[PDB]
């Protein structure tokens, strides 16, 4: 994982990849929970 991508820690990159997950529930949660 390139460090310049999506912040500086690994959880940021993990959540950014999770928001592109095929499963609708996981994508929706990953893109809405922190905005909540």
């Amino acid at each position: 994982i390139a460090h310049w991508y999506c912040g500086h820690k690994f959880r940021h990159r993990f959540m950014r990849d999770k928001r592109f997950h095929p499963s609708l529930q996981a994508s929706h949660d990953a893109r809405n929970r922190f905005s909540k």
Partner: protein, 49 residues
């Protein structure tokens, strides 16, 4: 205005703009002084007896 809405689909099931919960009687208790009782009866959720 629920009786004559100027928009379509008053309610929605989005993630950050859910307004169905904000239509129950508890929220209208605050403005019960100005409340229209017929409008409350026809458009409200979890109304008591």
């Amino acid at each position: 205005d629920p009786d004559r809405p100027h928009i379509k689909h008053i309610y929605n099931q989005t993630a950050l703009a859910r307004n169905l919960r904000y239509a129950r009687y508890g929220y209208f208790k605050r403005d019960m002084h100005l409340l229209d009782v017929d409008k409350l009866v026809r458009h409200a959720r979890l109304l008591p007896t």
